[PDB]
């Protein structure tokens, strides 16, 4: 890699990975459109395992992201429209509070106050199906911006029901194969648990456990890679051959809300280029990005902007993700971490990289 790669990322993430006390960690810088991997530590202490290109990461919830371009490829399909209201795709969902709750509100946290997690005790389609006809709305509609992995989840199960496909199916055969991310899983193989890290948490090593409407909000594994060519993807939309995809790609960056300086697209979350950098730190500590905050509409919504910085931070119970890219200087960074370390820890140390390379 250039000099000034290496140079920028080792003072700081180095420094990031010592004061956060990271027991392994892969970045890819993307610097003109093509990625430099970095990695440290081991993706399993105890058996002094590296880590390497090829490790698994838990993604948290920068697997929203997949599920967003996953909705914006089946509106592109015809498959869905934003404005349908959800009873089309769920109609025994029959209490009178969905009445005007569209696909649009579920994808981008609006559909007034959706809880953050789909309860524990949910675990069949039948105990789904009363968590939502019970679920009682803090807000009206398109009013209020409440993160929440219940709201896109539903998003993505319903998304894909006109194409008669499993969420799991129609995420591989419509976003993983034709992108050519080949380890990228919403379930390991068994083949490929040799390249899973452990994540860590209060030193003990841990896994994401199974949960309702996971693999929609939170449960996708990858590797530096996969997660590099991803970036690239929604970097250069255009070079992707399958239309309806390069379209779902745009789609998923387009503005549908408006919060102080943050845009709502479909998983991805954007702010005009240039940023204040301590906006996007800031904003991204959880007592900031999990509270509810008033929305204005975009109407229409803003077409993708290419002078925008795009991102979306995860985490599970032992990893830390972060993804952030600039299309209009086709720069971008993934981060990937098994330990779940503060979010603004990993918002700076991302805008030290792209500033000292813009
Ligand atoms: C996106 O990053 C959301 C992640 N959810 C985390 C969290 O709430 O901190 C997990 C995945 C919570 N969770 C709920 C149900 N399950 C199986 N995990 S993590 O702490 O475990
Ligand atoms: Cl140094
Ligand atoms: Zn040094
Ligand atoms: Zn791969
Ligand atoms: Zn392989």
Known sequence: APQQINDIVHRTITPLIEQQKIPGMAVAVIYQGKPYYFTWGYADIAKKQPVTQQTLFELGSVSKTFTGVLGGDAIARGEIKLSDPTTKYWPE????????????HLATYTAGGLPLQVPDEVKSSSDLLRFYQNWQPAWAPGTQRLYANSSIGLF???????????????????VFQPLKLNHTWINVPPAEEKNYAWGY???????????????????????????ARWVQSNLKPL???????????????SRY??????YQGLGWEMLDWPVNPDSIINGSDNKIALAA???????????????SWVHKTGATGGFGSYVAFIPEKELGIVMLANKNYPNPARVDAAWQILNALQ
């Open 239 to 253: 070079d992707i051959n399958e239309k309806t995809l390069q379209q779902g790609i745009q789609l998923a960056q």
């Open 201 to 227: 948490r209060e030193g003990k090593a841990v896994h994401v456990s199974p949960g309702a409407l996971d693999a929609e909000a939170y449960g996708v594994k990858s590797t530096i890679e996969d997660m």
């Open 156 to 174: 993505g199960a319903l998304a894909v029901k006109p194409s008669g496909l499993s969420f799991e199916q129609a995420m591989q055969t419509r």
């Open 257 to 262: 809300w408006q919060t102080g300086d943050m």
């Open 93 to 104: 969902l029959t209490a009178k509070q969905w009445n005007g709750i569209t696909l649009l």
């Open 293 to 307: 905050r008033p929305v204005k509409a975009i109407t229409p919504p803003t077409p993708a902007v290419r002078a």
